[PDB]
Coordinates of C-alpha atoms and ligand atoms in Angstrom, one line a residue:
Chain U
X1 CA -87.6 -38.6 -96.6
X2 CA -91.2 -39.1 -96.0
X3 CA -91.3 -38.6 -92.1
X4 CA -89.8 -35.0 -93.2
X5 CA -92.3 -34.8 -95.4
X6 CA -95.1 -35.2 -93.3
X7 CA -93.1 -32.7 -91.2
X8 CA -93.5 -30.2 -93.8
X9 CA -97.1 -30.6 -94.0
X10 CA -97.9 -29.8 -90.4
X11 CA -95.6 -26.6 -90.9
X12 CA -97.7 -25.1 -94.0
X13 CA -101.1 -26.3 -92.4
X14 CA -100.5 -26.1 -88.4
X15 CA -103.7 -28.2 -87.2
X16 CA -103.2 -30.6 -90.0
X17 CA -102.7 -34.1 -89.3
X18 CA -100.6 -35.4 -92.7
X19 CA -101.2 -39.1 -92.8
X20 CA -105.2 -38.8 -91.6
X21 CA -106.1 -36.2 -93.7
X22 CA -103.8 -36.9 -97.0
X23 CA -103.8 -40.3 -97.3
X24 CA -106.2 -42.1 -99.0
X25 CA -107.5 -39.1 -100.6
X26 CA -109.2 -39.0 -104.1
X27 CA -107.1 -41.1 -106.7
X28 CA -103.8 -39.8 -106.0
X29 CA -103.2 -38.8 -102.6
X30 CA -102.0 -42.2 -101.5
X31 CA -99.9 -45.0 -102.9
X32 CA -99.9 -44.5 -106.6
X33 CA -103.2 -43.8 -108.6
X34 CA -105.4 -43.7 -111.8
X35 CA -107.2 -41.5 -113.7
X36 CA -107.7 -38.1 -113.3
X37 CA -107.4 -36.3 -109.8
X38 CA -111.1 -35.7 -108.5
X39 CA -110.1 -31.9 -107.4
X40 CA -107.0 -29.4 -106.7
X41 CA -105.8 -31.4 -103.6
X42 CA -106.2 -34.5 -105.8
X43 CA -104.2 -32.8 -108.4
X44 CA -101.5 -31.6 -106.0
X45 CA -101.1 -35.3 -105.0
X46 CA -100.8 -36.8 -108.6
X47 CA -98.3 -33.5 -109.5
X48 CA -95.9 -34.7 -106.4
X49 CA -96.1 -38.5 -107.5
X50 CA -94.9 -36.8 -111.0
X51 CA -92.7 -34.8 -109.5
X52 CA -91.1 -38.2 -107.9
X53 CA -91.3 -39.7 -111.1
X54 CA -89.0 -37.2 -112.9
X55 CA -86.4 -37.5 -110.0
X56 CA -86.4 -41.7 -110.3
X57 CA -85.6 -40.8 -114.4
X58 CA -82.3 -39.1 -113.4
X59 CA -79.5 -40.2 -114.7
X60 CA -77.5 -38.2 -112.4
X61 CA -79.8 -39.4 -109.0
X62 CA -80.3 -43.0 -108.0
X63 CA -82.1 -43.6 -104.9
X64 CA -82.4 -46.3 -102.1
X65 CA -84.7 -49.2 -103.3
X66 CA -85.3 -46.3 -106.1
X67 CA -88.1 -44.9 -103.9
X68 CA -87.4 -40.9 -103.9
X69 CA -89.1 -41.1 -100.2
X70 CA -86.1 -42.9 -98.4
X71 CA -83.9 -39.6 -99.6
X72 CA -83.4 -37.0 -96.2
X73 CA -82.6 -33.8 -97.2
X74 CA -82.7 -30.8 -94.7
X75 CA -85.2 -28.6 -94.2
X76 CA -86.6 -25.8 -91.7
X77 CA -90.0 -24.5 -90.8
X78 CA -90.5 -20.7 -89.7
X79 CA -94.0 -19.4 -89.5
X80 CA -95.7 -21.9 -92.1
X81 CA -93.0 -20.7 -94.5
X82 CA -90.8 -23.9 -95.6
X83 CA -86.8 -23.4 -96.7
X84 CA -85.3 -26.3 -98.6
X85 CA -81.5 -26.1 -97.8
X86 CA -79.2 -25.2 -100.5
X87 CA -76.5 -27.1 -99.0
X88 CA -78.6 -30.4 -100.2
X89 CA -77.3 -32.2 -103.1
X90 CA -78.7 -31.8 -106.9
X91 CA -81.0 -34.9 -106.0
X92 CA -81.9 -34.2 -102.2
X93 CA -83.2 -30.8 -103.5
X94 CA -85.2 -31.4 -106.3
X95 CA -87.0 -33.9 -103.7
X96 CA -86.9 -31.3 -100.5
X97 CA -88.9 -29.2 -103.7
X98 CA -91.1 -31.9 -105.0
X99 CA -91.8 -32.4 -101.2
X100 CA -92.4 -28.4 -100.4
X101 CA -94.5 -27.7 -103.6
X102 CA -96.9 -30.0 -102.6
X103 CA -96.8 -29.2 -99.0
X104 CA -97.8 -25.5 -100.4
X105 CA -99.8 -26.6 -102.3
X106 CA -101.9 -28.8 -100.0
X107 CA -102.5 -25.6 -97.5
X108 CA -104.0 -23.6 -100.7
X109 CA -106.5 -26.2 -101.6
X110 CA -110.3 -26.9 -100.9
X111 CA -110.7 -30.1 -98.8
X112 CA -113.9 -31.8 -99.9
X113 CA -114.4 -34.5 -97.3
X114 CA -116.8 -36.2 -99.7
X115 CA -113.3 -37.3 -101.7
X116 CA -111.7 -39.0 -99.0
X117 CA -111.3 -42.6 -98.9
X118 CA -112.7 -42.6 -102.5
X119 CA -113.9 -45.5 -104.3
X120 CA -111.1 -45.2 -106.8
X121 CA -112.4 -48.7 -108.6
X122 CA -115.5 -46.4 -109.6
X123 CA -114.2 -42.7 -109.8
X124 CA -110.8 -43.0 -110.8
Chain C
X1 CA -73.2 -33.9 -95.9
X2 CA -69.5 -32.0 -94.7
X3 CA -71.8 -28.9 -93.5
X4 CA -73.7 -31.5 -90.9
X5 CA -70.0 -33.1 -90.1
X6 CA -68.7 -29.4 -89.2
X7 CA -71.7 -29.1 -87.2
X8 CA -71.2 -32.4 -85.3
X9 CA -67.8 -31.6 -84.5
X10 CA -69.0 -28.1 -83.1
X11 CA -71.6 -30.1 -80.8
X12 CA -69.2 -32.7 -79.4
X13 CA -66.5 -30.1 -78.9
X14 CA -68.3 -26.8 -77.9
X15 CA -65.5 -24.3 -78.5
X16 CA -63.9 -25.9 -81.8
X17 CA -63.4 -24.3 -85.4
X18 CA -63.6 -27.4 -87.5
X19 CA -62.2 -26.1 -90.2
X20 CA -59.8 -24.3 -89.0
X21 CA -58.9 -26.8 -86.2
X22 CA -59.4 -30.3 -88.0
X23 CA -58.6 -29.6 -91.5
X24 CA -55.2 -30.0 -92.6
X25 CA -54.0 -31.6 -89.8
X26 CA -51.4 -34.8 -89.3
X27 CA -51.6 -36.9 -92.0
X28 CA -55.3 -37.4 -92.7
X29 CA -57.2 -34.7 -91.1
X30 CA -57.6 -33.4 -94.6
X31 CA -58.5 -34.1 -98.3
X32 CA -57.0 -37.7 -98.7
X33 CA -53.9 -38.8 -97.1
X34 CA -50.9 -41.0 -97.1
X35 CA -48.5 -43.2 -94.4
X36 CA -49.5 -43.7 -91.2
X37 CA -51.4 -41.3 -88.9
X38 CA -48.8 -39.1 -86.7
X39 CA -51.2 -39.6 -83.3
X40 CA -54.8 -40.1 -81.8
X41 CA -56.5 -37.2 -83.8
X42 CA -55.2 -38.0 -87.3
X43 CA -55.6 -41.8 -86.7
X44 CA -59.5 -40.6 -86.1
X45 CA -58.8 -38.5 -89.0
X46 CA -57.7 -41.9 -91.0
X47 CA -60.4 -44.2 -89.5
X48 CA -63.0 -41.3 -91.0
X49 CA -61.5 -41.7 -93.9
X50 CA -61.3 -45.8 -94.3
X51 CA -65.4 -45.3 -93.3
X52 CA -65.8 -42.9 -96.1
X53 CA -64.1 -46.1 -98.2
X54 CA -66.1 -48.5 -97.1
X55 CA -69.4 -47.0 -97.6
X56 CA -68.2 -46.1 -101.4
X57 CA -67.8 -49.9 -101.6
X58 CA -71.6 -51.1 -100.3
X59 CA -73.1 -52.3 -103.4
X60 CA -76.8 -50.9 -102.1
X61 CA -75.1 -47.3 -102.2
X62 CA -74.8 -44.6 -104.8
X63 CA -73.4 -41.3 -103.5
X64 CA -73.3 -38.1 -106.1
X65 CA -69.9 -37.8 -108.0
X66 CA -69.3 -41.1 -105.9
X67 CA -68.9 -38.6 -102.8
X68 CA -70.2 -39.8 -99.4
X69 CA -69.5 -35.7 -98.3
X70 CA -72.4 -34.6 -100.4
X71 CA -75.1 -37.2 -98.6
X72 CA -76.9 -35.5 -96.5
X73 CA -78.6 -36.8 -93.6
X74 CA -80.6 -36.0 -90.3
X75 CA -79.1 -35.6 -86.6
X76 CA -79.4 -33.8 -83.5
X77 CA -77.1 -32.8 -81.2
X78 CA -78.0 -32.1 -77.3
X79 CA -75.3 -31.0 -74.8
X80 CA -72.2 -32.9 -76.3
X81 CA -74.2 -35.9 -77.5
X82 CA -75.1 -36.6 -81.0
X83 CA -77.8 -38.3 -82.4
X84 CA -78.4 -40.1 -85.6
X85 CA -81.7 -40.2 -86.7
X86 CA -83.2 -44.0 -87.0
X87 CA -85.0 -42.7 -89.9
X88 CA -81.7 -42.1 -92.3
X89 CA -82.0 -44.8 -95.1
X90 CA -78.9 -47.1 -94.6
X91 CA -76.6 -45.5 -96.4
X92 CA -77.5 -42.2 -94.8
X93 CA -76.9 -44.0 -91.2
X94 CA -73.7 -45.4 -92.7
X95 CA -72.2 -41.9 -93.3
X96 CA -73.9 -40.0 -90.0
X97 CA -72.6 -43.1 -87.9
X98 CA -69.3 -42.3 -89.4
X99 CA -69.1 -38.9 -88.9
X100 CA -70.4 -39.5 -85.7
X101 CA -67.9 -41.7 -84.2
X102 CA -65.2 -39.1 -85.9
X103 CA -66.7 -36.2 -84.0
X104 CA -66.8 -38.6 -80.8
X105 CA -63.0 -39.7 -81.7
X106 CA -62.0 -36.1 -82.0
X107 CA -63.5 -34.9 -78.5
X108 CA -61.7 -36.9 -76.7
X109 CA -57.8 -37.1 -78.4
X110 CA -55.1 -34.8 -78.1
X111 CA -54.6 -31.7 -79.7
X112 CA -51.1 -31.6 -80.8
X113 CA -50.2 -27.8 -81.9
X114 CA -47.2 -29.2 -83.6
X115 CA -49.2 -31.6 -86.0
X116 CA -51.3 -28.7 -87.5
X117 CA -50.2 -27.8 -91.0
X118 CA -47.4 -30.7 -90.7
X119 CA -45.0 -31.2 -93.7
X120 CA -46.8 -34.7 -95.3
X121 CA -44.6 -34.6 -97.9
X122 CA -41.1 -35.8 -95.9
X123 CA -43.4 -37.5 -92.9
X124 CA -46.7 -38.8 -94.0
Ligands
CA1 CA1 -100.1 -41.0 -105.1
CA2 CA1 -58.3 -37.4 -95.0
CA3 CA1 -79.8 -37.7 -98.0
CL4 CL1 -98.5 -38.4 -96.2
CL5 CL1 -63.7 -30.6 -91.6

Protein backbone atom coordinates (compact mmCIF):
# COMPACT_ATOMS: atom_id res chain seq x y z
CA UNK A 1 0.00 0.00 0.00
CA UNK A 2 1.34 3.35 -0.33
CA UNK A 3 1.67 4.36 3.45
CA UNK A 4 4.10 1.08 3.37
CA UNK A 5 5.56 2.34 0.74
CA UNK A 6 6.60 5.52 2.02
CA UNK A 7 7.62 3.24 5.00
CA UNK A 8 10.10 1.56 2.87
CA UNK A 9 11.68 4.69 1.73
CA UNK A 10 12.61 6.01 5.15
CA UNK A 11 14.12 2.42 5.75
CA UNK A 12 16.57 2.51 2.62
CA UNK A 13 17.32 6.41 3.08
CA UNK A 14 17.01 6.99 7.13
CA UNK A 15 16.85 11.01 7.13
CA UNK A 16 14.65 10.90 4.09
CA UNK A 17 11.35 12.43 4.26
CA UNK A 18 9.33 10.28 1.24
CA UNK A 19 6.46 12.56 0.37
CA UNK A 20 8.69 16.06 0.60
CA UNK A 21 11.43 14.89 -1.14
CA UNK A 22 9.82 12.32 -3.84
CA UNK A 23 6.90 13.97 -4.85
CA UNK A 24 6.64 16.24 -7.33
CA UNK A 25 9.98 15.36 -8.60
CA UNK A 26 11.06 15.69 -12.30
CA UNK A 27 8.28 14.23 -14.66
CA UNK A 28 7.69 11.15 -12.97
CA UNK A 29 8.11 11.12 -9.42
CA UNK A 30 4.54 12.13 -8.72
CA UNK A 31 1.06 11.34 -10.06
CA UNK A 32 1.69 10.00 -13.54
CA UNK A 33 4.02 11.81 -16.12
CA UNK A 34 5.34 12.61 -19.60
CA UNK A 35 8.28 12.44 -21.43
CA UNK A 36 11.37 11.33 -20.59
CA UNK A 37 12.62 11.24 -16.79
CA UNK A 38 15.06 14.36 -16.36
CA UNK A 39 17.68 12.05 -14.32
CA UNK A 40 18.25 8.41 -12.53
CA UNK A 41 15.78 9.40 -9.68
CA UNK A 42 13.40 10.61 -12.40
CA UNK A 43 13.94 7.30 -14.08
CA UNK A 44 13.49 5.20 -10.96
CA UNK A 45 10.05 7.00 -10.61
CA UNK A 46 8.75 6.36 -14.24
CA UNK A 47 10.34 2.47 -13.86
CA UNK A 48 7.94 2.04 -10.60
CA UNK A 49 4.87 3.65 -12.38
CA UNK A 50 5.84 0.85 -15.13
CA UNK A 51 6.31 -1.53 -12.74
CA UNK A 52 2.54 -0.67 -11.56
CA UNK A 53 1.44 -0.77 -14.89
CA UNK A 54 2.50 -4.43 -15.57
CA UNK A 55 0.76 -5.49 -12.25
CA UNK A 56 -2.82 -3.60 -13.33
CA UNK A 57 -2.27 -5.92 -16.90
CA UNK A 58 -2.54 -9.16 -14.88
CA UNK A 59 -4.96 -11.31 -15.63
CA UNK A 60 -4.30 -13.26 -12.55
CA UNK A 61 -4.30 -9.78 -10.15
CA UNK A 62 -7.18 -7.27 -9.91
CA UNK A 63 -6.85 -4.63 -7.54
CA UNK A 64 -9.12 -2.19 -5.44
CA UNK A 65 -10.38 0.71 -7.66
CA UNK A 66 -7.50 -1.03 -9.95
CA UNK A 67 -4.90 1.30 -8.19
CA UNK A 68 -1.81 -1.27 -7.27
CA UNK A 69 -1.28 1.41 -4.20
CA UNK A 70 -4.43 0.33 -2.18
CA UNK A 71 -2.68 -3.50 -2.16
CA UNK A 72 -0.84 -4.13 1.67
CA UNK A 73 1.52 -6.70 1.54
CA UNK A 74 4.05 -7.25 4.39
CA UNK A 75 7.18 -6.11 4.68
CA UNK A 76 10.20 -5.57 7.25
CA UNK A 77 13.07 -3.17 7.56
CA UNK A 78 16.49 -4.26 9.17
CA UNK A 79 19.37 -1.96 8.84
CA UNK A 80 18.31 -0.10 5.49
CA UNK A 81 17.97 -3.59 4.04
CA UNK A 82 14.17 -4.24 2.92
CA UNK A 83 12.56 -8.13 2.89
CA UNK A 84 9.36 -8.51 0.92
CA UNK A 85 7.57 -11.49 2.62
CA UNK A 86 7.29 -14.58 0.73
CA UNK A 87 4.16 -15.46 2.48
CA UNK A 88 2.46 -12.46 0.23
CA UNK A 89 0.38 -13.52 -2.59
CA UNK A 90 1.51 -13.73 -6.48
CA UNK A 91 0.06 -10.03 -6.71
CA UNK A 92 0.98 -8.49 -3.14
CA UNK A 93 4.61 -9.49 -4.12
CA UNK A 94 5.19 -8.37 -7.35
CA UNK A 95 4.00 -4.92 -5.79
CA UNK A 96 5.94 -5.31 -2.22
CA UNK A 97 8.95 -5.69 -5.36
CA UNK A 98 7.83 -2.87 -7.61
CA UNK A 99 7.58 -0.97 -4.24
CA UNK A 100 11.33 -2.17 -2.87
CA UNK A 101 13.13 -1.76 -6.31
CA UNK A 102 12.37 1.68 -6.27
CA UNK A 103 12.91 2.28 -2.71
CA UNK A 104 16.52 0.87 -3.62
CA UNK A 105 16.75 2.54 -6.13
CA UNK A 106 15.90 5.98 -4.85
CA UNK A 107 18.86 5.65 -1.92
CA UNK A 108 21.44 4.98 -5.00
CA UNK A 109 20.51 8.09 -6.96
CA UNK A 110 21.89 11.73 -7.28
CA UNK A 111 19.29 14.19 -5.92
CA UNK A 112 19.55 17.32 -8.10
CA UNK A 113 17.33 19.86 -6.21
CA UNK A 114 17.24 21.92 -9.41
CA UNK A 115 14.59 18.96 -10.62
CA UNK A 116 12.20 19.32 -8.01
CA UNK A 117 8.91 20.70 -8.52
CA UNK A 118 9.75 20.88 -12.25
CA UNK A 119 7.91 22.67 -14.76
CA UNK A 120 6.83 19.50 -16.45
CA UNK A 121 4.61 21.64 -19.15
CA UNK A 122 8.17 22.88 -20.40
CA UNK A 123 10.74 19.93 -19.60
CA UNK A 124 8.69 17.02 -19.80
CA UNK B 1 -3.49 -13.97 5.00
CA UNK B 2 -3.80 -17.55 7.34
CA UNK B 3 -0.01 -16.85 8.54
CA UNK B 4 -1.33 -13.17 10.05
CA UNK B 5 -4.69 -15.25 11.33
CA UNK B 6 -2.26 -17.84 13.24
CA UNK B 7 -0.42 -14.90 14.50
CA UNK B 8 -3.67 -13.16 15.81
CA UNK B 9 -4.78 -16.10 17.52
CA UNK B 10 -1.15 -16.43 19.25
CA UNK B 11 -1.62 -12.66 20.47
CA UNK B 12 -5.13 -12.94 21.82
CA UNK B 13 -4.32 -16.19 23.47
CA UNK B 14 -0.57 -16.06 24.59
CA UNK B 15 0.07 -19.74 25.09
CA UNK B 16 -1.98 -21.23 22.08
CA UNK B 17 -0.74 -23.57 19.04
CA UNK B 18 -3.15 -22.49 16.42
CA UNK B 19 -2.72 -25.06 14.37
CA UNK B 20 -2.41 -27.54 16.50
CA UNK B 21 -5.14 -26.30 18.91
CA UNK B 22 -7.81 -24.64 16.43
CA UNK B 23 -7.48 -26.74 13.37
CA UNK B 24 -9.53 -29.66 13.08
CA UNK B 25 -11.69 -29.04 15.76
CA UNK B 26 -15.76 -29.44 16.23
CA UNK B 27 -17.40 -29.09 13.16
CA UNK B 28 -15.83 -26.06 11.62
CA UNK B 29 -12.60 -25.30 13.20
CA UNK B 30 -11.16 -26.65 9.93
CA UNK B 31 -11.21 -26.66 6.04
CA UNK B 32 -15.00 -26.32 5.39
CA UNK B 33 -17.59 -27.84 7.41
CA UNK B 34 -21.04 -29.23 7.75
CA UNK B 35 -24.30 -29.32 10.49
CA UNK B 36 -24.23 -27.30 13.17
CA UNK B 37 -21.30 -26.21 15.44
CA UNK B 38 -20.83 -28.75 18.54
CA UNK B 39 -20.17 -25.57 21.15
CA UNK B 40 -18.84 -21.87 21.57
CA UNK B 41 -15.43 -22.50 19.79
CA UNK B 42 -16.58 -24.20 16.68
CA UNK B 43 -19.63 -21.88 16.42
CA UNK B 44 -16.65 -19.02 16.30
CA UNK B 45 -15.13 -21.48 14.02
CA UNK B 46 -18.55 -21.32 11.80
CA UNK B 47 -19.19 -17.60 12.16
CA UNK B 48 -15.28 -17.25 10.68
CA UNK B 49 -16.29 -19.15 8.17
CA UNK B 50 -19.87 -17.53 7.11
CA UNK B 51 -17.35 -14.07 7.21
CA UNK B 52 -15.01 -15.70 4.88
CA UNK B 53 -18.50 -16.19 2.62
CA UNK B 54 -19.63 -13.06 2.80
CA UNK B 55 -16.59 -11.24 1.80
CA UNK B 56 -16.27 -13.78 -1.41
CA UNK B 57 -19.69 -12.35 -2.20
CA UNK B 58 -18.88 -8.26 -2.08
CA UNK B 59 -19.02 -7.32 -5.59
CA UNK B 60 -15.95 -4.60 -4.94
CA UNK B 61 -13.73 -7.70 -3.96
CA UNK B 62 -11.51 -10.05 -5.88
CA UNK B 63 -9.40 -12.49 -3.70
CA UNK B 64 -6.65 -14.89 -5.52
CA UNK B 65 -8.04 -18.36 -6.51
CA UNK B 66 -11.25 -16.67 -4.99
CA UNK B 67 -9.46 -17.26 -1.50
CA UNK B 68 -9.89 -14.60 1.22
CA UNK B 69 -6.86 -16.86 3.25
CA UNK B 70 -4.35 -15.59 0.71
CA UNK B 71 -5.19 -11.56 1.35
CA UNK B 72 -2.88 -10.32 3.24
CA UNK B 73 -3.23 -7.45 5.37
CA UNK B 74 -1.68 -5.15 8.13
CA UNK B 75 -2.27 -5.52 12.11
CA UNK B 76 -0.67 -5.18 15.36
CA UNK B 77 -1.07 -6.94 18.29
CA UNK B 78 -0.16 -5.28 21.91
CA UNK B 79 -0.65 -7.36 25.14
CA UNK B 80 -3.87 -9.44 24.05
CA UNK B 81 -5.36 -6.71 21.90
CA UNK B 82 -5.35 -6.63 18.22
CA UNK B 83 -5.37 -4.00 15.91
CA UNK B 84 -6.49 -3.62 12.45
CA UNK B 85 -4.84 -1.17 10.61
CA UNK B 86 -7.27 1.82 9.26
CA UNK B 87 -5.12 1.79 6.24
CA UNK B 88 -6.19 -1.89 4.87
CA UNK B 89 -8.30 -1.19 1.58
CA UNK B 90 -11.90 -2.49 2.38
CA UNK B 91 -11.65 -5.70 1.59
CA UNK B 92 -8.44 -6.09 3.42
CA UNK B 93 -10.38 -4.58 6.74
CA UNK B 94 -13.21 -7.00 5.79
CA UNK B 95 -10.92 -10.14 6.22
CA UNK B 96 -8.59 -8.64 9.31
CA UNK B 97 -11.90 -7.58 11.03
CA UNK B 98 -12.95 -11.13 10.54
CA UNK B 99 -10.09 -12.82 11.70
CA UNK B 100 -10.16 -10.51 14.30
CA UNK B 101 -13.31 -11.05 15.88
CA UNK B 102 -12.42 -15.08 15.45
CA UNK B 103 -9.23 -14.68 17.40
CA UNK B 104 -11.37 -12.48 20.02
CA UNK B 105 -14.27 -15.32 19.81
CA UNK B 106 -11.66 -17.93 20.41
CA UNK B 107 -10.01 -16.22 23.63
CA UNK B 108 -12.75 -16.26 25.39
CA UNK B 109 -14.84 -19.89 24.65
CA UNK B 110 -14.26 -23.09 26.05
CA UNK B 111 -11.80 -25.56 25.18
CA UNK B 112 -13.48 -28.75 25.02
CA UNK B 113 -10.73 -31.69 24.82
CA UNK B 114 -13.39 -33.92 23.71
CA UNK B 115 -14.29 -31.89 20.52
CA UNK B 116 -10.67 -32.00 19.13
CA UNK B 117 -10.33 -34.36 16.12
CA UNK B 118 -14.23 -35.17 16.57
CA UNK B 119 -15.79 -37.81 14.19
CA UNK B 120 -17.86 -35.10 11.61
CA UNK B 121 -18.79 -37.77 9.68
CA UNK B 122 -21.73 -39.42 12.14
CA UNK B 123 -22.09 -35.76 14.20
CA UNK B 124 -21.45 -32.77 12.10
CA1 LIG C 1 4.66 8.93 -11.51
CA1 LIG D 1 -14.27 -24.25 8.68
CA1 LIG E 1 -3.22 -7.30 0.67
CL1 LIG F 1 5.74 8.96 -2.16
CL1 LIG G 1 -5.71 -22.11 11.94
Amino acid sequence: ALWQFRSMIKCAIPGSHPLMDFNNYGCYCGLGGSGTPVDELDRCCETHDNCYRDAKNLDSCKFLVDNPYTESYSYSCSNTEITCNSKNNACEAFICNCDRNAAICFSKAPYNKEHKNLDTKKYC
